């Protein structure tokens, strides 16, 4: 019996120019799993299937390693040298298991293991398109609008889809028009092939610059980071390979115009063309535009920075509803804090007396120590008291003894108090 499953399964197959060499492995893992349950210890088997005569011969499989972990599984290599010397370490020695029929019932685990393999092969060629066009700009004709998502037609009945948060916030749709997108990061989601097309993710703006600017197709200029707000404002960072080329002047055009055309493609999208620097600090100074940066103290180990702005352009440095500080806190890679020059002055006066008070937690003899703290800081216990050459040759006299006193109290203080409070069990 069945006797028809092979005819109908050579009827389904050869649909992507490979008839038998996926269903070889499907019958391998299909029939190899069936004898796992009837003999209840550890029995791994492999079959050799032939399509011509219909008879199938299964073969006994034993694992060849050096020691016996769980019994009877291991041929224990020196016995594998006797039956066939061509068999080596890594493959299994063939022994015959007596079974020749088409099969007894089950005969059905075959049927939907076939239904499984055609679906994951479908998934494989859907992934093959997901390699061929990620990421391109392609566009399609609207078919259906199911009140949260929408349906496209990209040509040859290639149906796509667009989410809610994946749009510009106020879009209108008519069944028939075409919208462009980059595509995307793959979910299946169910058994099928769906394609979420984006217009609010940054890669839409980026690939619009790629078609718009031809120097990206010439590798003259080089774009680094992109921060957006899908209907209000964007900041995108460019550099150039040759120092004579101006990437900003290449990205604006005449008269507007590239940021004007890509802007009118995405509504009221403001585009800030900004230069990328190798310096982490100066790229933020470029990125706060159109602010006038007074001074920035860059704080390491947390990716944080502090920004002060003089006068008048405070709400333009932060932006309306924090948009300049948010998009600027999205472009670079370091967290930003925008304050005044007087809040920066009170910040330094706060951190100085704060370091003084956290050093009043230590032993803290008379006021000359705090004078050293105001003059030469070196806060947070001198960064484990490791500074070179008498704090780079400061003069109060006191060459050897007093610096050994402050390094002795420093190392003993951080040792005792840091092991007392900072070190956990």
């Amino acid at each position: 019996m069945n006797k028809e499953i092979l005819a109908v399964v050579e009827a389904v197959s050869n649909e992507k120019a490979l008839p038998r060499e996926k269903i070889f492995e499907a019958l391998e893992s299909a029939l190899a799993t069936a004898t796992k349950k009837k003999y209840e210890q550890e029995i791994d088997v492999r079959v050799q299937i032939d399509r011509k005569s219909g008879d199938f011969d299964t073969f006994r499989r034993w694992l060849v390693v050096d020691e016996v972990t769980q019994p009877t599984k291991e041929i224990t290599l020196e016995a594998a040298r006797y039956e066939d010397e061509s068999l080596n370490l890594g493959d299994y020695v063939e022994d015959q298991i007596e079974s020749v029929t088409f099969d007894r019932i089950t005969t059905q685990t075959a049927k939907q293991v076939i239904v499984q393999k055609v679906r994951e092969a479908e998934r494989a060629m859907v992934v093959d398109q997901f390699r061929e066009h990620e990421g391109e700009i392609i566009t399609g004709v609207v078919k259906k609008v199911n009140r949260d998502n929408i349906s496209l037609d990209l040509g040859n009945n290639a149906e796509a889809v667009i989410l809610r948060e994946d749009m510009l916030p106020r879009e209108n749709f008519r069944p028939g028009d075409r919208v462009r997108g980059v595509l995307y990061s793959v979910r299946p989601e169910a058994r099928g092939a769906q394609l979420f097309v984006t217009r609010s993710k940054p890669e839409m703006l980026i690939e619009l610059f790629r078609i718009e600017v031809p120097e990206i197709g010439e590798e003259v200029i080089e774009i680094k980071a992109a921060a957006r707000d899908p209907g209000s404002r964007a900041k995108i960072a460019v550099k150039t390979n040759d120092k004579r080329i101006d990437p900003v002047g290449a990205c604006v055009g005449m008269r507007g115009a590239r940021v004007q055309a890509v802007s009118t493609e995405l509504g009221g999208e403001r585009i800030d063309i900004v230069l990328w620097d190798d310096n982490p600090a100066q790229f933020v100074i470029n990125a706060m535009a159109p602010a006038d940066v007074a001074s920035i103290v860059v704080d390491e180990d947390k990716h944080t920075m502090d920004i002060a702005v003089e006068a008048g352009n405070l709400a333009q440095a932060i932006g309306r509803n924090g948009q300049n500080v948010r998009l600027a806190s999205q472009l670079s890679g370091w967290e930003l804090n925008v304050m005044t020059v007087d809040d920066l002055q009170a910040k330094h006066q706060a951190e100085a007396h704060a370091a003084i008070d956290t050093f009043t937690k230590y032993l803290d003899i008379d006021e000359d120590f705090a004078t050293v703290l105001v003059e030469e800081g070196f806060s947070t216990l001198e960064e484990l008291a490791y500074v070179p050459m008498k704090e780079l040759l400061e003069i109060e006299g006191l060459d050897e003894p007093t610096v050994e006193a402050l390094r002795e109290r420093a190392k003993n203080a951080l040792a005792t108090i840091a092991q007392a409070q900072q070190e956990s069990l």
Binding site: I211, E212, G217, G253, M254, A257
Partner: protein
């Protein structure tokens, strides 16, 4: 048969790039290329003050010159027309096409 293609532009890199794209497309889709030829750079002007009172700024009134080309093609197939249909032409360039 023609399609005839005439293109207008403000920047020369986009129209040289774009005509290279169209000629490369017509060469790949199995058809023959007629042209392309250039035409003289027609100058124009249009006074745009984005600001108040008339000429206290002493700067230019946003003048520009205009480049334009033309290219033809004879005996195409359906692969050519859905090929040029699927092709996403860049913005800022005007396409004055024909067909017949």
């Amino acid at each position: 048969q023609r399609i005839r293609i005439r293109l207008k532009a403000f920047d020369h890199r986009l129209i040289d790039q774009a005509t290279a794209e169209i000629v490369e497309t017509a060469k790949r889709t199995g058809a023959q290329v007629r042209g392309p030829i250039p035409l003289p750079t027609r100058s124009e002007r249009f006074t745009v003050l984005i600001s108040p009172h008339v000429n206290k700024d002493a700067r230019d009134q946003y003048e520009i010159r205009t480049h334009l080309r033309l290219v033809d093609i004879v005996e195409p197939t359906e692969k050519t027309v859905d090929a040029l249909m699927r092709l996403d032409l860049a913005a800022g360039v005007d396409v004055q096409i024909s067909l017949g």
